[PDB]
Amino acid sequence: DRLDAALRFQQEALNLRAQRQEILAANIANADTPGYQARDIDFASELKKVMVGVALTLTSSHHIPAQAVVDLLYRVPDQPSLDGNTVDMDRERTQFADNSLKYQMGLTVLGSQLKGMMNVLQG
Amino acid sequence: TQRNETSNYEVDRTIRHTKMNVGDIERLSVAVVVNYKTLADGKPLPLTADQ
Numbered sequence: 001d002r003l004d005a006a007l008r009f010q011q012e013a014l015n016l017r018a019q020r021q022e023i024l025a026a027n028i029a030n031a032d033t034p035g036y037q038a039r040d041i042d043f044a045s046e047l048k049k050v051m052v053g054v055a056l057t058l059t060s061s062h063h064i065p066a067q068a069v070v071d072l073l074y075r076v077p078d079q080p081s082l083d084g085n086t087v088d089m090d091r092e093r094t095q096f097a098d099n100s101l102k103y104q105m106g107l108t109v110l111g112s113q114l115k116g117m118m119n120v121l122q123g
Numbered sequence: 124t125q126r127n128e129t130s131n132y133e134v135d136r137t138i139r140h141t142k143m144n145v146g147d148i149e150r151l152s153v154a155v156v157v158n159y160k161t162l163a164d165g166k167p168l169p170l171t172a173d174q
Contacts (some may be wrong), residue, residue: 056131063131 010110012050016043017103019070021123023103024096034076034083038075039091046070 020041030036056066077086145158 056129059131059133064129067127067129071125 001098007071007110009051010106010113013047014103014110016041016047016050016070017099017106018075021096021099021103023072024092024099027092028096029086031089034085036085036087038077038087039072040095041070042073088103 020043023040027038027040054066057063058065075086075088075091078091080087157170159169160168
């Protein structure tokens with residue numbers, strides 16, 4: 001559908017921001033686990049990958065339709081801890097706040113596009 | 124381990140429509156009686172098992 005193509009980029013950006021938000025909050029929650037590595041995703045490359053499948057064929061009514069079913073990069077440690085935990089509070093707190101801001105911005109842009117498509121139709 | 128398998132099949136199909144004939148035979152029973160054998164003398168000699 002053409003409607004999907006217009007809203008594909010913002011939807012994928014919003015979903016990627018939510019996933020990275022979950023990853024950052026997991027990094028915050030597991031700050032005290034000894035031996036836990038701080039993981040993160042490269043937002044731009046994954047957004048390229050998602051932006052850049054074959055529903056199985058249903059011959060009749062009984063035939064069952066096809067059933068549907070990111071890469072994590074390690075953060076470079078800054079300070080060496082003794083328990084092997086590489087999670088840094090300041091870095092991930094700033095990243096968490098930034099991801100929240102960008103999620104809000106994506107919501108704003110997507111809502112503006114939908115509202116414009118709506119006022120085009122209203123009449 | 125996780126295996127999710129979905130398969131759609133096409134099957135052979137045979138429809139047979141039959142209208143039985145009216146007047147067919149269900150059960151036949153037959154009674155046959157034979158005579159004896161009267162020779163030139165005239166004695167009614169019975170038949171044999173083979174015959």
